[PDB]
Amino acid sequence: QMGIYAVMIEKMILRDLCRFMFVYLVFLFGFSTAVVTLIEDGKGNSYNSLYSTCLELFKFTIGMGDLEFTENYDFKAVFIILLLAYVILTYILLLNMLIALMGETVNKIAQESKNIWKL
Amino acid sequence: SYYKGQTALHIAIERRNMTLVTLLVENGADVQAAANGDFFKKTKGRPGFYFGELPLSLAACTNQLAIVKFLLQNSWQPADISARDSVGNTVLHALVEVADNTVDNTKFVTSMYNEILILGAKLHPTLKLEEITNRKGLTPLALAASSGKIGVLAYILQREIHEPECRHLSRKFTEWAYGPVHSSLYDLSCIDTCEKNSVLEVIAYSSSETPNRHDMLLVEPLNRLLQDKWDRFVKRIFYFNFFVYCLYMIIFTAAAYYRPVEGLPPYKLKNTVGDYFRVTGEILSVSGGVYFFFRGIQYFLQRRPSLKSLFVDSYSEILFFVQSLFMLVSVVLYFSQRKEYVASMVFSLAMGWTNMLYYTRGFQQMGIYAVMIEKMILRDLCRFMFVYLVFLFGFSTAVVTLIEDGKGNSYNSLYSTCLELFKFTIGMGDLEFTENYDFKAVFIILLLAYVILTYILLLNMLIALMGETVNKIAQESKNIWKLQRAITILDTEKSFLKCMRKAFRSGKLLQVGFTPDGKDDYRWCFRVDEVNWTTWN
Amino acid sequence: SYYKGQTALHIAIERRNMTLVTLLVENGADVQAAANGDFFKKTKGRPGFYFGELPLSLAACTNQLAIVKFLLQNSWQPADISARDS
Ligand SMILES: CC(C)(C)c1ccc(/C=C\C(=O)Nc2ccc3c(c2)OCCO3)cc1
Ligand code: NA
């Protein structure tokens, strides 16, 4: 029984997590680039770094996203629109995309996991 | 008047009475009678069905084999088979029109189709009855292609004949068979982009109104032709566009990230190398954006996409157009002394980086993923967003009505309440974000109702719906990806019209059989080997 | 050359004509003939299928029960069953 679980973990670390990670990396990189372009820091202040922005959006996907993590921008509307677009595209859409995809996987390949454990 | 186009002949056919029709035509009744009545027009919104003005068109549309046989073999006035009806359609065009996705319909409009081809060949061996075009200008292949008669299309594309004399009008030329191993050729007369409208082009550019559009491509000669070209000469070009787009987006990202912050645009041209690199990046980005804009306009004009549903068949084109628009408006505002260009630039950057997904159609697996993302951004996400917006707006209005701020103080704003409930949606909602209220019970009950209705009820409702969607439409995402690749390859091969054409051809010129005129058949075929262990004949 | 490995015997088998093959081998046609042609090689990326150089290998690869029976039971030159192909 635990063997089938390990087989599932392997199969879906080499089947689905790779693809979803590619696409999520594209989204996060694009939106992080956009946001960091928007920030100016011309006066919680060195958000500029792209790494920091990537980290904030990642916090967004793990349920610790701060929609007002920075107030140094110059168009609050643009910043909010970008963050909301990111949340809708990743948090509510892509994560649930992944959940749906993995449901499809397991539904198909329960027996496959069994046989791979036998092997 | 209505009762002038018709005659006793067509009605006698309608009853399917061979004796009645032959007796009627015995005295020498005209066979060229045309039923140019609105009741017989193709309009599907009105009663009646179009079967062709010539009565033979009616009979062929019907299963009256005897009537077509006798009319074509009658000693007097054998109605010409090659006839353009009012709409320019031939009895073959009418046949394909009458064809449906129904199996029995497929059987009828396939058997009769082949039979009539043979018969017309017999009467006129040297008549290109399968080439005549209607007013719309489509051959019967082009008709089944533009309409989507998957059965008639397949019948034409795999058409084989065993009679040596009339095998010329045949689509598939079997070559040999040494054991189950047996090659299979084809014709590719207009399959390839070598005609006014190539059935591949017709399928690719046809709107989503046509049914089974993505499903027709599965016909083996077409699908194998697609895969052959893709692996032969397009995949490399597609990867080259992917790589150049990556370089474009990286240059744009680098330029934006280093956009000057001091002073309204435009700026100046320092003597340092960094300034020069920055301007090079900016100008390269501008060039890319303007190219994308022009290409979007070109697609708009050439295709003139169905305005009713343009988001379901050109999603990527709209995305690229919008990103180009944002870049262009960044350019207009930039020179127009205003630091508001950064907004357009940022939207463009996000749009392009996210659009990188468009290239994921070249890969089997990631392509299905992108197709799913598009399908559920246009299918499930919009509906859920509407309902969630209703909930959030109502509850935000309620809460803001409740707040007073009559003394974490400027929360009266409806925007703040909407943001706070949204945080509730994304798992950062503070149940006591405000204490300027005056009824704790009311405030807490409202927040709890919102949480139950959205966070635990709706969001999970969307998860359930999306599970249903994927479970249903995995295969649909696969097929849509296939169609996306088909459009990709067609566009690529069209792109090099002036670059070159000789090497961009599929199939091989061959001469297998002979035409009744005692001449050779120079046809561009394409072999297909198959292994069948049972036929054995 | 390509047309040296093959013989009338293997083709006569290919048509599945028991009468033709038995007549051909009636005069004493060789049974050890080997079809060492690239067309018969095992490569799956090229046309053709490998069925074994010995014609009996072809017939067994085919469902020709009669041919295997006769050649194994023929009065003259029953092709040896134990044969290593190329
Ligand atoms: C540029 C901003 C930040 C305003 C923005 C633009 C679009 C979205 C949402 C979606 C999006 O851009 N979705 C998409 C775009 C292109 C694709 C694709 C999906 O998948 C199929 C291949 O190409 C969000 C924010
Ligand atoms: Na959470």
Curated annotation (Swiss-Prot), chain A:
Phosphorylation by CAMKII seems to regulate binding to vanilloids. Phosphorylated and modulated by PRKCE, PRKCM and probably PRKCZ. Dephosphorylation by calcineurin seems to lead to receptor desensitization and phosphorylation by CAMKII recovers activity. A motif (Selectivity filter) lies at residues 63-66. Residues 70-77 are extracellular. Changing residue 66 to N: Strongly reduces the affinity for pore blocker ruthenium red and lowered channel permeability for Mg(2+). Changing residue 56 to Q: Slight modification of pore attributes. Ca(2+) binds at residue 66. Na(+) 2 binds at residue 63. It comes from the Eukaryota. Changing residue 56 to K: Abolishes channel activity. Restored channel activity. Residues 1-11 are cytoplasmic. The chain crosses the membrane at residues 12-39, 78-106. Signal peptide: none annotated. Predominantly expressed in trigeminal and dorsal root sensory ganglia. Expressed also in hippocampus, cortex, cerebellum, olfactory bulb, mesencephalon and hindbrain. High expression in the cell bodies and dendrites of neurons in the hippocampus and in the cortex. In the brain detected also in astrocytes and pericytes (at protein level). Isoform 1 and isoform 3 are expressed in brain and peripheral blood mononuclear cells. Residues 47-69 dip into the membrane without crossing it. It is found in: Postsynaptic cell membrane; Cell projection, Dendritic spine membrane; Cell membrane. Changing residue 68 to Q: Minor modification of pore attributes. Non-selective calcium permeant cation channel involved in detection of noxious chemical and thermal stimuli. Seems to mediate proton influx and may be involved in intracellular acidosis in nociceptive neurons. Involved in mediation of inflammatory pain and hyperalgesia. Sensitized by a phosphatidylinositol second messenger system activated by receptor tyrosine kinases, which involves PKC isozymes and PCL. Activation by vanilloids, like capsaicin, and temperatures higher than 42 degrees Celsius. Homotetramer. Interacts with PIRT. May also form a heteromeric channel with TRPV3. Interacts with CALM, PRKCM and CSK. Interacts with PRKCG and NTRK1, probably by forming a trimeric complex. Interacts with the Scolopendra mutilans RhTx toxin. Interacts with the spider Tau-theraphotoxin-Hs1a. Interacts with TMEM100. Interacts with PACS2. The association domain (AD) is necessary for self-association. Responses evoked by capsaicin, but not by low pH and heat, can be antagonized by capsazepine. Belongs to the transient receptor (TC 1.A.4) family. TrpV subfamily. TRPV1 sub-subfamily. This is Transient receptor potential cation channel subfamily V member 1. It comes from Rattus norvegicus (Rat). The chain holds residues 561 to 699 of 838 of the full protein.
